[PDB]
Motif scaffolding. Structure first.
Motif, PDB file in Angstrom:
ATOM      1  N   UNK A 232       0.847  -1.181   0.000  1.00 40.52           N
ATOM      2  CA  UNK A 232       0.000   0.000   0.000  1.00 40.52           C
ATOM      3  C   UNK A 232       0.886   1.237   0.000  1.00 40.52           C
ATOM      4  N   UNK A 233       0.376   2.319  -0.585  1.00 43.77           N
ATOM      5  CA  UNK A 233       1.110   3.578  -0.655  1.00 43.77           C
ATOM      6  C   UNK A 233       0.202   4.686  -0.142  1.00 43.77           C
ATOM      7  N   UNK A 234       0.680   5.423   0.855  1.00 43.39           N
ATOM      8  CA  UNK A 234      -0.100   6.446   1.537  1.00 43.39           C
ATOM      9  C   UNK A 234       0.556   7.808   1.375  1.00 43.39           C
ATOM     10  N   UNK A 235      -0.219   8.785   0.915  1.00 46.88           N
ATOM     11  CA  UNK A 235       0.285  10.133   0.700  1.00 46.88           C
ATOM     12  C   UNK A 235      -0.784  11.118   1.136  1.00 46.88           C
ATOM     13  N   UNK A 236      -0.384  12.096   1.949  1.00 49.93           N
ATOM     14  CA  UNK A 236      -1.304  13.128   2.423  1.00 49.93           C
ATOM     15  C   UNK A 236      -0.508  14.389   2.731  1.00 49.93           C
ATOM     16  N   UNK A 237      -0.734  15.442   1.950  1.00 48.31           N
ATOM     17  CA  UNK A 237      -0.003  16.681   2.117  1.00 48.31           C
ATOM     18  C   UNK A 237       1.468  16.561   1.783  1.00 48.31           C
ATOM     19  N   UNK A 238       2.315  16.659   2.804  1.00 52.35           N
ATOM     20  CA  UNK A 238       3.751  16.548   2.663  1.00 52.35           C
ATOM     21  C   UNK A 238       4.331  15.239   3.143  1.00 52.35           C
ATOM     22  N   UNK A 239       3.500  14.235   3.391  1.00 49.57           N
ATOM     23  CA  UNK A 239       3.934  12.947   3.911  1.00 49.57           C
ATOM     24  C   UNK A 239       3.907  11.927   2.783  1.00 49.57           C
ATOM     25  N   UNK A 240       4.980  11.148   2.658  1.00 52.62           N
ATOM     26  CA  UNK A 240       5.042  10.114   1.632  1.00 52.62           C
ATOM     27  C   UNK A 240       5.579   8.846   2.278  1.00 52.62           C
ATOM     28  N   UNK A 241       4.734   7.821   2.383  1.00 46.80           N
ATOM     29  CA  UNK A 241       5.114   6.560   3.007  1.00 46.80           C
ATOM     30  C   UNK A 241       4.666   5.410   2.115  1.00 46.80           C
ATOM     31  N   UNK A 242       5.538   4.421   1.941  1.00 46.54           N
ATOM     32  CA  UNK A 242       5.245   3.238   1.144  1.00 46.54           C
ATOM     33  C   UNK A 242       5.391   2.013   2.032  1.00 46.54           C
ATOM     34  N   UNK A 243       4.362   1.170   2.074  1.00 45.64           N
ATOM     35  CA  UNK A 243       4.404  -0.027   2.900  1.00 45.64           C
ATOM     36  C   UNK A 243       4.115  -1.255   2.052  1.00 45.64           C
TER      37      UNK A 243
ATOM     38  N   UNK B 263      11.221  -0.815  10.419  1.00 48.87           N
ATOM     39  CA  UNK B 263      10.930   0.564  10.053  1.00 48.87           C
ATOM     40  C   UNK B 263      12.204   1.223   9.543  1.00 48.87           C
ATOM     41  N   UNK B 264      12.099   1.915   8.414  1.00 51.47           N
ATOM     42  CA  UNK B 264      13.243   2.601   7.834  1.00 51.47           C
ATOM     43  C   UNK B 264      12.728   3.748   6.983  1.00 51.47           C
ATOM     44  N   UNK B 265      13.382   4.899   7.091  1.00 55.56           N
ATOM     45  CA  UNK B 265      12.977   6.093   6.366  1.00 55.56           C
ATOM     46  C   UNK B 265      14.078   6.505   5.400  1.00 55.56           C
TER      47      UNK B 265
ATOM     48  N   UNK C 131      18.606   5.023  16.607  1.00 56.11           N
ATOM     49  CA  UNK C 131      17.772   4.652  17.743  1.00 56.11           C
ATOM     50  C   UNK C 131      16.336   5.104  17.529  1.00 56.11           C
ATOM     51  N   UNK C 132      16.153   6.213  16.811  1.00 52.02           N
ATOM     52  CA  UNK C 132      14.815   6.707  16.512  1.00 52.02           C
ATOM     53  C   UNK C 132      14.059   5.722  15.632  1.00 52.02           C
ATOM     54  N   UNK C 133      14.753   5.116  14.667  1.00 48.88           N
ATOM     55  CA  UNK C 133      14.095   4.138  13.816  1.00 48.88           C
ATOM     56  C   UNK C 133      13.662   2.909  14.607  1.00 48.88           C
ATOM     57  N   UNK C 134      14.511   2.430  15.517  1.00 45.78           N
ATOM     58  CA  UNK C 134      14.130   1.284  16.338  1.00 45.78           C
ATOM     59  C   UNK C 134      12.994   1.599  17.306  1.00 45.78           C
ATOM     60  N   UNK C 135      12.974   2.809  17.875  1.00 44.21           N
ATOM     61  CA  UNK C 135      11.862   3.163  18.754  1.00 44.21           C
ATOM     62  C   UNK C 135      10.553   3.228  17.979  1.00 44.21           C
ATOM     63  N   UNK C 136      10.581   3.782  16.762  1.00 47.10           N
ATOM     64  CA  UNK C 136       9.338   3.855  15.999  1.00 47.10           C
ATOM     65  C   UNK C 136       8.937   2.484  15.468  1.00 47.10           C
TER      66      UNK C 136
ATOM     67  N   UNK D  72       6.862  -7.173   8.045  1.00 48.83           N
ATOM     68  CA  UNK D  72       6.286  -5.935   7.538  1.00 48.83           C
ATOM     69  C   UNK D  72       7.397  -4.908   7.384  1.00 48.83           C
ATOM     70  N   UNK D  73       7.478  -4.292   6.206  1.00 47.12           N
ATOM     71  CA  UNK D  73       8.478  -3.274   5.923  1.00 47.12           C
ATOM     72  C   UNK D  73       7.765  -1.998   5.501  1.00 47.12           C
ATOM     73  N   UNK D  74       8.150  -0.882   6.112  1.00 50.13           N
ATOM     74  CA  UNK D  74       7.576   0.429   5.837  1.00 50.13           C
ATOM     75  C   UNK D  74       8.687   1.415   5.515  1.00 50.13           C
ATOM     76  N   UNK D  75       8.451   2.269   4.524  1.00 48.07           N
ATOM     77  CA  UNK D  75       9.439   3.252   4.111  1.00 48.07           C
ATOM     78  C   UNK D  75       8.783   4.616   3.978  1.00 48.07           C
ATOM     79  N   UNK D  76       9.450   5.635   4.515  1.00 49.36           N
ATOM     80  CA  UNK D  76       8.971   7.013   4.479  1.00 49.36           C
ATOM     81  C   UNK D  76       9.796   7.770   3.446  1.00 49.36           C
TER      82      UNK D  76
END
Lengths: 141, 251, 208, 70, 353
Positions: B51-62, B81-83, B98-103, B127-131
Motif C-alpha cells: 500500500x502507498x499512503x500520501x497526504x499533504x507533505x507525507x510520503x510513506x510506502x508499505x 521501520x526505515x525512512x 535509535x529513533x528508527x528502532x523506537x518507531x 512488515x516493511x515500511x518506508x517514508x
C-alpha cells in the motif's frame, strides 16, 4: 663524530646521489670508453701535435685545472695562451646535475679529504688532465 | 569506516548550520481541519501485499511479505521501520538509528492488537515500511499504511488500525492542533499520536511526551485523536472497496 | 608488443589438494584449491555444486571492489566447471595476491586455471587472461605495467577460451571506440596461443 | 654588472678594474656561469642566435648572494 | 567443513615414540626445522619457511596527523590474519578465539619490548607524522605459527626503507627514490619468540613441535626474549601445570636458540644486502628452483601483431548498420513523458468512482 659535527653544523651534504641523479653519466666503460665523435673534431681545432701542453700541480692533484703553453712562431715572437678545461657538455641546463651544482655552490675542503662537486668518477677520471688521453678544453690564445 | 559501502569524506557539516536565513514564522490556522488524504492499495506487483499512503507533505510506502518458515501455537510478527535518507532537513546515516528502532517498536506494539496470530502456528509475518518524505505527522501514517497493506494481503485481522497526530502550541494559551506539519511540529511543546480501532472502539497504541502537565489537556488530546481516527475511516473504507473491486475484476 | 617474463610453480603447500603460484614478470599471485568436500545444508544445491571465491589484498581489508572482482572470477569458473558430475558438494577457489606490478586480474585468472588443473577438477576447456592498455594516441601494448597504466587513457582485460578462443570475461577501464576494442580483442586472441603453449609444455613436462 | 655603477666594478686590491675567475668550472659555480657565457659569446659572434635563455637580473643576484653565503 | 578427526592409533604412536625420545621426522629434542628466507623486490617484503610453514610479511608506511597527546611520536598498527588456505578449518569468522591470543602475543612482544625507535618518526609535531603498519599472512599451517610469524615480522621490519623529506624553516617537501634515496630504520634489538610443548603432564618436553605433535600435547609455553640476555615475554597456556626449575631450563633453551636464530637472520640479511649492492638480479622470480619439474622459463615474445588492423576493419565493415525507425516522445504535463506503445487515454480519471 667531530667530523660529522663539522659537516652537519656548517651546512654541507654527505649524501651520494640517487639512481636518476646517477644514471645520467658519461659511460666510461672498458668495453666502450669515451672517444670524440669526428664531427666535433671537424667543428673544433685540434692542437695535440703542433704544440706542447703540460702542467705543474700540487701533490695529490687527482684533478687538474691549470694549464698553459708558450712557444715561438715562424718569426721569433712568443705566443701566450692559458688552457682551461671546458666542462659544459655534461651539465645541460635545467638538468639534475645543474640543480645539484646550483645547490652545492662551493666545494668544501677539510684537511683530510676533498669533496667532489660531481659524482666521483665523472670528473675524477674523465675531466682531469692525466695520462695523455683526449680531453675537451678551451684554449685562449 | 564501512567496508560494505563507498567511502567518502570522513566528516561533512550540512549547510543548514551555516544557513544565514533566520527561522521564519509558521502562522495560524483552524485546529478543526484535516489535510485531505488519498489512499491506494495493491501498488507493488511482486509483493504479496502493499500500500502507498500520501497526504499533504507525507510520503510513506508499505509492503507486506507473506508467511515464511520459522508462543508457538502462535506465529511471530517481525517488523522493520526505515525512512529514506532524502527526508527532512538533514541527511541520515544509512546503517540505522535509535529513533528508527523506537518507531519500529511503537509500530509493533500497535499492529499485533489487530491481527489474530492464533491462526499461523510456527509461521511469521514480516512488515516493511518506508517514508519517502517527512512533511507532517509520521507515526499517523506508518500505522494506517501498514494496516492497509495487511488488509489487502489477505491475512485475518479483527479490525483495522487508524492513526492520528497532535501537537501543542507554544503560546501563553496553548491549544492542541490536529494533523500538525513540520512548521507546526518543530515549534511545538508536546505531541500525541493515537491508534484507534474504529468499530471495536479500543485504543491500540498511545505515545506522548512534552511540556503539558495538567491532566485535563490530555483528555481532549486523546478524544480529538479518537475523533480523527473516526473521521479518517471512510476514505480507507472506499479504498479497500476499490482495491478489491479491481483485484477481483482482474481475474 | 611483447609479453614479459613468465614464471610458475606447482605443489608448494602440503595441506591443500593442489597449489599453484603464477608470477608474470614482477607481479605474482598464489592459489590453492580444496577438492569436492562437504557443504553447509543451507547453501547446498541439488544436481550442481557451489563455487566460493575469495581474494586477499596486501594493503587494507577487502571491500566492495574486491568482491566485485570476485564475482567475475566466480562467474568465469562457473562456465568451465562440470558441476553436474558432482552434486551436493562444494568446490572453492581462493586466489592470493603476493606481489602487484600491473595486469593483476589476468595473472589471477591464470593462477585460478592452473590451480584447478593441478587440483584435478573436471574441466570443459582451459581459460587464459590477457590485458590490453592502449596509450593516449592508440599504440596498443599487451600485458602492460603500472608505469604505462598510469598515463594510458584506457585499460582492457579479457579472458579467452582454449578451444575456439571465444570471449568469457571482459573488464574495461577507460573510454574508447569500438574499432580499437576489436583490435585489442584480436591481439588477445593472438596472444593466448603462446600462453596455451606454456600450459601444454608445463603439463607434458610434469608427467615425464 | 649593470645592476650597479662603474665605481663598483673595480678590483682595487689587485689594481685591476675587473677580475673574476675562469680557471675552475668544476669546484665552483660562478665559473660554469662564465663557461656558458663565454661559449655563448664565441658561438654568437657568427650572426646567429643561441636558442635557450641564459639568466635574468633577479636570478643572478640571488645566485651571487647564495654563493657569497656558501 | 571441519578437519579430519584424530584416530586412537596416532596418539598411541606419538606417545610410545615420545616416551622413547625419538620423533617422526628424525630431529632430536632440542632442534629446529631448518629455515629458508626469500626477499621481494620492493622493500619490506619477505617469505620465511620454517619446516613446511609459510608466512608472508610486508611493511608499509603512510602519513597522518598524530591524534591528541603524544604529539612527538608515531603510531604502529598491527593486524594478524589467518588465511583459509593455511588449513581447512580456518574460516572468516569461526576461529575468533585464536586470532585474539595471536594478535596479542605479537603486539605485546613487538610494541612493549621497545626495539623500534618510534621517537624519530616525526616531521612536525601536532602535524603530519609517519604511521607505519605491519602486515603478516599465514599461508600454510604446519605447526608453530608464532615462531615463524615473529621471524617474519622481524625480517620485514629490518628490511623496510622509508621515504624521506626535507624540513627547514616552516616548509615541507616530499621526495621520491629518484629525487632522494630511501632511508633505513633504527632497530634497538630483535625480540624473537620460542615455544615449548609439554607431554603427559610435564614429564617430557619437545622443542619446535608440528601440528600432529600439537594434537597429542597438554599445553604450550612461549618465551620471547631478545638478543643479548634479556627476556621480553612469556605466556604459558593450554592445559599445563608447571614447576619452577623448568621455567629456568626453558629460559636457558630460549637463550641458546635465539642466539642461533639471530646468527642465521643476520647472515641472511647481510648476504641479501651484498647481492642487492653487487648489481645482480633479485626478486621473487629468481628464486624458483630450476632443478625441479614445476618451473619453466621463457624470455619475451612478440606474438605476431601483424594482422589486427585487417580483421578489425573487415569486422566493422561486414555488419549491419543501425536501423532507422526513430521513436517519438509523448508529453503528458511538464515533468512526465512516456515512450513505448503508450497508453490509450490521456490519463486515468474516475476509473472506479
Amino acid at each position: 663524530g667531530e667530523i660529522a659535527t663539522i659537516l652537519v653544523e656548517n651546512s654541507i651534504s654527505v649524501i651520494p646521489f640517487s639512481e636518476a641523479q646517477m644514471c645520467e653519466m658519461p659511460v666510461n666503460t672498458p668495453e666502450s670508453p669515451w672517444k670524440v665523435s669526428p664531427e666535433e673534431e671537424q667543428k673544433r681545432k685540434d692542437l695535440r701535435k703542433s704544440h706542447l701542453v703540460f702542467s705543474i700541480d700540487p701533490k695529490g692533484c687527482e684533478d687538474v685545472n691549470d694549464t698553459l703553453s708558450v712557444r715561438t712562431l715562424n718569426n721569433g715572437n712568443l705566443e701566450l695562451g692559458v688552457h682551461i678545461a671546458d666542462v659544459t657538455h655534461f651539465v645541460a641546463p635545467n638538468s639534475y646535475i645543474d640543480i645539484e651544482a646550483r645547490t652545492r655552490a662551493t666545494t668544501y675542503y677539510l684537511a683530510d679529504r676533498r669533496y667532489d662537486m660531481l659524482p666521483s668518477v665523472l670528473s675524477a677520471d674523465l675531466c682531469s688532465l692525466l695520462g695523455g688521453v683526449d680531453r675537451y678544453a678551451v684554449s685562449i690564445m | 569506516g564501512d567496508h560494505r559501502r563507498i567511502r567518502g569524506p570522513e566528516e561533512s557539516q550540512p549547510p543548514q548550520l551555516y544557513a544565514a536565513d533566520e527561522e521564519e514564522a509558521p502562522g495560524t490556522r483552524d485546529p478543526t481541519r484535516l489535510r485531505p488524504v488519498y489512499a491506494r492499495a495493491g501498488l507493488l506487483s511482486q509483493a504479496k501485499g502493499s500500500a502507498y499512503l500520501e497526504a499533504g507533505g507525507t510520503k510513506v510506502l508499505c509492503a507486506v511479505s507473506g508467511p515464511r518458515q520459522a508462543a508457538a501455537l502462535r506465529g511471530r510478527l517481525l517488523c522493520d521501520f526505515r525512512r529514506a535518507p532524502f527526508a527532512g532537513r538533514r541527511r541520515r546515516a544509512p546503517p540505522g538509528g535509535c529513533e528508527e528502532r523506537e518507531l519500529a517498536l511503537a509500530l509493533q506494539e500497535a499492529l499485533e492488537p489487530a491481527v489474530r496470530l492464533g491462526r499461523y502456528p510456527r509461521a511469521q509475518l514480516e512488515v516493511s515500511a518506508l517514508l519517502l518524505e517527512d512533511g507532517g505527522s509520521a507515526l499517523a501514517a506508518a500505522l494506517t499504511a501498514a494496516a492497509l497493506a495487511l488488509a489487502d494481503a489477505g491475512v485475518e485481522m479483527y479490525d483495522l488500525v487508524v492513526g492520528c497526530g497532535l501537537s501543542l502550541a507554544p503560546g501563553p494559551a496553548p491549544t492542541w492542533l490536529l494533523d500538525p506539519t513540520r512548521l507546526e511540529e518543530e515549534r511545538a511543546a508536546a505531541g500525541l499520536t493515537v491508534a484507534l480501532m474504529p468499530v471495536l472502539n479500543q485504543v491500540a497504541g498511545l505515545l506522548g511526551s512534552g511540556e503539558g502537565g495538567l491532566t485535563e489537556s490530555w483528555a481532549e488530546a486523546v478524544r480529538l485523536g479518537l475523533e480523527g481516527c473516526q473521521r479518517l475511516y471512510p476514505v480507507l473504507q472506499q479504498s479497500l472497496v476499490r482495491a478489491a473491486r479491481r483485484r477481483g475484476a482482474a481475474a | 608488443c611483447s609479453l614479459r617474463h613468465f614464471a610458475c610453480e606447482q605443489n608448494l603447500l602440503s595441506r591443500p589438494d593442489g597449489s599453484a603460484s603464477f608470477l608474470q614478470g614482477d607481479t605474482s599471485v598464489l592459489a590453492g584449491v580444496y577438492g569436492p568436500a562437504e557443504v553447509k545444508v543451507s547453501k547446498e544445491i541439488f544436481n550442481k555444486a557451489t563455487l566460493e571465491v575469495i581474494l586477499r589484498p596486501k594493503i587494507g581489508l577487502p571491500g566492495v571492489a574486491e568482491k566485485s572482482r570476485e564475482r567475475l572470477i566466480r562467474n568465469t569458473c562457473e562456465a568451465v566447471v562440470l558441476g553436474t558430475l558432482h552434486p551436493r558438494t562444494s568446490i572453492t577457489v581462493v586466489l592470493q595476491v603476493v606481489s602487484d606490478a600491473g595486469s593483476l586480474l589476468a595473472c589471477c585468472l591464470n593462477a585460478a586455471c592452473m590451480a584447478l588443473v593441478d587440483a584435478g577438477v573436471p574441466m570443459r576447456a582451459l581459460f587464459c587472461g590477457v590485458a590490453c592498455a592502449l596509450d593516449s594516441d592508440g599504440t596498443l601494448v599487451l600485458d602492460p605495467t603500472s608505469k604505462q597504466e598510469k598515463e594510458a587513457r584506457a585499460v582492457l582485460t579479457f579472458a579467452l577460451d582454449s578451444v575456439e578462443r571465444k570471449l568469457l570475461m571482459s573488464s574495461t577501464k577507460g573510454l574508447y571506440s569500438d574499432t580499437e576494442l576489436q583490435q585489442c580483442l584480436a591481439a588477445a586472441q593472438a596472444a593466448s596461443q603462446h600462453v596455451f603453449r606454456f600450459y601444454r609444455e608445463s603439463l607434458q613436462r610434469r608427467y615425464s | 654588472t649593470g645592476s650597479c655603477a662603474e665605481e663598483e666594478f673595480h678590483h682595487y686590491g689587485l689594481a685591476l678594474d675587473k677580475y673574476t675567475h675562469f680557471t675552475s668550472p668544476i669546484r665552483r659555480y660562478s665559473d660554469i656561469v662564465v663557461h656558458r657565457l663565454l661559449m655563448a659569446a664565441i658561438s654568437k659572434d657568427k650572426k646567429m642566435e643561441i636558442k635557450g635563455n641564459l639568466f635574468s637580473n633577479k636570478d643572478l643576484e640571488e645566485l651571487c648572494r647564495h654563493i657569497n653565503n656558501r | 567443513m571441519k578437519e579430519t578427526p584424530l584416530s586412537n592409533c596416532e596418539r598411541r604412536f606419538l606417545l610410545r615414540a615420545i616416551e622413547e625420545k625419538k620423533r617422526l621426522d628424525g630431529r632430536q629434542t632440542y632442534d629446529y626445522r631448518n629455515i629458508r628466507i626469500s626477499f621481494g623486490t620492493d622493500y619490506g617484503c619477505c617469505i620465511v619457511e620454517l619446516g613446511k610453514t609459510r608466512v608472508l610479511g610486508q611493511v608499509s608506511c603512510e602519513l597522518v596527523s598524530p591524534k591528541l597527546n603524544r604529539a612527538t611520536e608515531g603510531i604502529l598498527f598491527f593486524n594478524l590474519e589467518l588465511s583459509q588456505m593455511a588449513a581447512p578449518a580456518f574460516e572468516p569468522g569461526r576461529q575468533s578465539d585464536l586470532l585474539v591470543k595471536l594478535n596479542r602475543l605479537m603486539e605485546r612482544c613487538l610494541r612493549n619490548s621497545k626495539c623500534i625507535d618510534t621517537e624519530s618518526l616525526c616531521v612536525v609535531a601536532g602535524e603530519k607524522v609517519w604511521q607505519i603498519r605491519v602486515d603478516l599472512h599465514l599461508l600454510n599451517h604446519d605447526g608453530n605459527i608464532i615462531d615463524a610469524a615473529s621471524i617474519a615480522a622481524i625480517v620485514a621490519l629490518c628490511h623496510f626503507r622509508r621515504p624521506d623529506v626535507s624540513v627547514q624553516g616552516d616548509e615541507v617537501t616530499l621526495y621520491t627514490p629518484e629525487e632522494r634515496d630511501p632511508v633505513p630504520l633504527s632497530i634497538h634489538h630483535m625480540p624473537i619468540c620460542v615455544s615449548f610443548a609439554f607431554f603427559q603432564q610435564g614429564t617430557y618436553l619437545l622443542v619446535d613441535p608440528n601440528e600432529r605433535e600439537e594434537r597429542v600435547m597438554d599445553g604450550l609455553l612461549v618465551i620471547a626474549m631478545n638478543k643479548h640476555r634479556e627476556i621480553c615475554t612469556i605466556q604459558s597456556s593450554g592445559g599445563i601445570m608447571l614447576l619452577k626449575d623448568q621455567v629456568l631450563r626453558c629460559s636457558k633453551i630460549a637463550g641458546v636458540k635465539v642466539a642461533e636464530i639471530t646468527e642465521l637472520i643476520l647472515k641472511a640479511l647481510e648476504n641479501d644486502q651484498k647481492v642487492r649492492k653487487e648489481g645482480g638480479k633479485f626478486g621473487f622470480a629468481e628464486s624458483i628452483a630450476n632443478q625441479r619439474i614445476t618451473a619453466f622459463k621463457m624470455e619475451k615474445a612478440p606474438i605476431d601483431t601483424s594482422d589486427v588492423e585487417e580483421k578489425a576493419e573487415e569486422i566493422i565493415a561486414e555488419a549491419e548498420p543501425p536501423s532507422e525507425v526513430v521513436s517519438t516522445p509523448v508529453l503528458w504535463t511538464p515533468g512526465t513523458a512516456q515512450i513505448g506503445e503508450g497508453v490509450e487515454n490521456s490519463w486515468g480519471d474516475l476509473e472506479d468512482s
